[PDB]
Amino acid sequence: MIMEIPAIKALSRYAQWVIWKKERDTKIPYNPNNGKKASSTDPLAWGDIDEAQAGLVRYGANGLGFVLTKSDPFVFIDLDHVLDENKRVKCEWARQLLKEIKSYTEISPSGDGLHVVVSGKLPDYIKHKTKFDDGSALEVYESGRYMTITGEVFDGRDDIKELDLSILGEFAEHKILDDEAIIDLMKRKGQWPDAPADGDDWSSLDMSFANRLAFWCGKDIERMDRIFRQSPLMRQKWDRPTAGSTYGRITLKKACDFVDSVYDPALRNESDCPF
Ligand SMILES: Nc1ccn([C@H]2CC[C@@H](COP(=O)(O)OP(=O)(O)OP(=O)(O)O)O2)c(=O)n1
Ligand SMILES: [Ca+2]
Ligand SMILES: [Ca+2]
Ligand SMILES: [Ca+2]
């Protein structure tokens, strides 16, 4: 039955299978060989799919499980309480997520949730759990955990695909004065940049804007930094460590060395063509 699904065929290549039983409102994984409680970090507590299938009958478990490790690339996307009694997606965020992420999708054991399995890499800035007022929730896991495997294929999505998971950052929660006069003057003179499009060298747009910022802000490297973070060119790379500094501070220091003219509340017909 399930072992013919292409996603189950892919997971069957690994000896990372367990079985699970519903102890109250949690799901405890078990070693399918000896029947003792299994650990998600000890590989010898697992077995292949055939030992999990056999151990499922012997000890009478609720279903199969697959342990996610730091060495296999499977991403477990858990959508809690997104289906109605007819197994139709009732949450609007889940309908949009399933449109943006098309991979193996199965109905979770309780019958009202969904599991999405993707071969990729999670964004490092999203939380592992995001609760919604709907009562639904979005959970993402890459390792140190096991996921229940039902095989109840949803919408014919029976194959694990390799996808980029940046779109998850728009569905899940994330984690960790006189500038306005300068900003208005820059927009006035056409010195304020647009948001970067697709195919553009974002790093090249940073230096051009930083060069302009070095002129209008008077090489006040702290003011140039405050204004850049309020610009459409801001991103995580700005604060990323690079050779003892940050990519942002190295860029702002380069801009100060590159420009000669300086706006000094007097006249502003000195440097740099408008965007
Ligand atoms: N140490 C463990 C063991 C259990 N879980 C895993 C097991 C399944 C997974 C998903 O959580 P649930 O939604 O509660 O289980 P489910 O398989 O998705 O079942 P359902 O969503 O239908 O209730 O979490 C975990 O977080 N880490
Ligand atoms: Ca779930
Ligand atoms: Ca859950
Ligand atoms: Ca992994």
Author numbering: 1 to 176, 191 to 289
What did the original publication write about this model?
PrimPols are a class of primases that belong to the archaeo-eukaryotic primase (AEP) superfamily but have both primase and DNA polymerase activities. Replicative polymerase from NrS-1 phage (NrSPol) is a representative of the PrimPols. The domain organization of NrSPol is similar to that of ORF904, while the PrimPol domain of NrSPol lacks the typical zinc finger motif found in ORF904 and many other AEP family proteins, and the C-terminus of NrSPol has a unique helicase domain that forms a ring-shaped architecture and increases the polymerization activity of NrSPol. The processivity of NrSPol is dramatically enhanced when associated with NrS-1 phage-encoded helicase and ssDNA-binding protein, indicating that NrSPol is a replicative DNA polymerase capable of synthesizing the NrS-1 phage genome de novo.
In this study, to explore the structural basis of N300’s primase and primer extension functions, we determined the crystal structures of N300 in complex with ddCTP. The structure of N300 consists of two domains: a primase-like (Prim/Pol) domain located at the N-termini and a HBD at the C-termini. The two domains are connected by a linker region (178–195), of which electron density is missing due to flexibility. As is shown in Figure 1B, the primase-like domain adopts a saddle-shaped fold that resembles the previously reported PrimPol domain of ORF904 but with several significant differences. Frist, the primase-like domain of NrSPol utilizes a serine-rich loop with an SPS motif (S108, P109, and S110) instead of the very conserved zinc finger motif in the active site. Interestingly, the electron density of the S108 side chain extends to the γ-phosphate of ddCTP with a close O-O distance of 2.5 Å, suggesting a strong hydrogen bond. The side chain of S110 is also adjacent to the γ phosphate of ddCTP, with a O-O distance over 2.6 Å. This structure indicates that S108 and S110 coordinate ddCTP and are likely critical for N300’s primase and polymerase activities. Second, a chelated metal ion is found at the bottom of the N300 structure that is not present in any other PrimPol or primase structures. Given the high Ca2+ concentration in the crystal solution (100 mM), this metal ion is assigned as Ca2+, which is coordinated by the main chain carbonyl oxygens of T69, D72, F74, and E142.
